[PDB]
């Protein structure tokens, strides 16, 4: 390869893009943006598979540049725009908004939210920088460079930004006893409380997260998103509240639903 790739095969797509095999050779390669290729979700994939508003690749384009869809308060006219974690998407005419949260399994889930919760967005700070004339800077996980932050924002905190002004309203400090969830790996979408944080000099610093029912698991430092201060979550959690039901309880719940439905 003499340059960057511009195509992407269907079976080379990530599994959480949640496609089929016998439809086409290629898959939608997203345009470059705030999020990585294997951690985002194209707008065409959502509008054509999840919401079922469109069936072909031209109907998605018509809806997309018809100026009907707004992305974090800004209208976007790219059908392969990368949408990732807590990307607030809004439809102005039928009055629906969706928040992208990983569910109990390894995928995205549709989650309708009220507009009052659609005005803000929780996002994770990545690194702290100092500008030219002594301006402190923040680099956010969706590449939002924010000037003049609060002095108590550290490396692995979570800030809440209003989508109309771009400023910080409130923040959550990285500490034990806070509600957390994991973004990537074998664990995905489980909601838990940070207990331990093991420090290894020169490598990945693993942590330990306990679920609300008695389960525990260990993830890396980069696989951390802090969502709450204590037990109350700052956003509306999806169905099941991220408990990671095992296969026996899942089978029992499906059998109970089948017996009750008839």
């Amino acid at each position: 390869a003499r340059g960057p790739k511009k195509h992407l095969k269907r079976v080379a797509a990530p599994k959480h893009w949640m496609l089929d095999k016998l439809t086409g050779v290629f898959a939608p390669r997203p345009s470059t943006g705030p999020h990585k290729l294997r951690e985002c979700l194209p707008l065409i994939i959502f509008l054509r598979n999840k919401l079922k508003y469109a069936l072909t690749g031209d109907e998605v384009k018509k809806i997309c540049m018809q100026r009907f869809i707004k992305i974090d308060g800004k209208v976007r006219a790219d059908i392969t725009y990368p949408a990732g974690f807590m990307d607030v998407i809004s439809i102005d005419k039928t009055g629906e908004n969706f928040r992208l949260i990983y569910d109990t399994k390894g995928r995205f889930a549709v989650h309708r939210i009220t507009p009052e919760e659609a005005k803000y967005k929780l996002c994770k700070v990545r690194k702290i920088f100092v500008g030219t004339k002594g301006i402190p800077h923040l680099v956010t996980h969706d590449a939002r460079t924010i000037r003049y932050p609060d002095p108590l924002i550290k490396m692995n905190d979570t800030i809440q930004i209003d989508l109309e002004t771009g400023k910080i309203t409130d923040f959550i400090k990285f500490d034990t006893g806070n509600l957390c969830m994991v973004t990537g790996g074998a664990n995905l979408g489980r909601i838990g409380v940070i207990t331990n944080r093991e420090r290894h000099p020169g490598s990945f610093d693993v942590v330990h997260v306990k679920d609300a029912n008695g389960n525990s698991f260990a993830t890396r430092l980069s696989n951390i998103f802090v969502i709450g201060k204590g037990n109350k979550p700052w956003i509306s959690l999806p169905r099941g509240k991220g408990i990671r039901l095992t296969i026996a309880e899942e089978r029992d719940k499906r059998l109970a639903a089948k017996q009750s439905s008839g």
Partner: protein
């Protein structure tokens, strides 16, 4: 007789049309033509009979069911703005050019072979 039960209804305010799946139950008859099921969707969904577009009819084994797609728009010109043109060619509301691909490719190559004003005249 033949009767219709629509399935998987939804509306689409993003594109001013109504998605549903139509299953056609015709015991003893053949496959229904698309015009007559368009008249049934007209007399059922209280709209004009020239705005409804149906396609994708697939018969079942034994000949009792026939499921497929069918779309109802709010108005005729709203349907003309956002629809594939070949379905309008099926329904007689559109005409397309009858030129083959090799003739167009040869004309494009012969236009590439010359420069200037003569490009518009070498290809007829």
């Amino acid at each position: 007789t033949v009767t219709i039960r629509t399935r998987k209804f939804m509306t689409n305010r993003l594109l001013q049309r109504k998605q549903m799946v139509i299953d056609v139950l015709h015991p003893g008859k053949a496959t229904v033509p698309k015009t007559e099921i368009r008249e049934k969707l007209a007399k059922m969904y209280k709209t004009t009979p020239d705005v409804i577009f149906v396609f994708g009819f697939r018969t079942h084994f034994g000949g009792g069911k026939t499921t497929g797609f069918g779309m109802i728009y709010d108005s005729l010109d709203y349907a003309k703005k956002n629809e594939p043109k070949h379905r309008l060619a099926r329904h007689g509301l559109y005409e397309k050019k009858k030129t083959s691909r090799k003739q167009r490719k040869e004309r494009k190559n012969r236009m590439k072979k010359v420069r200037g004003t003569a490009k518009a005249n070498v290809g007829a």
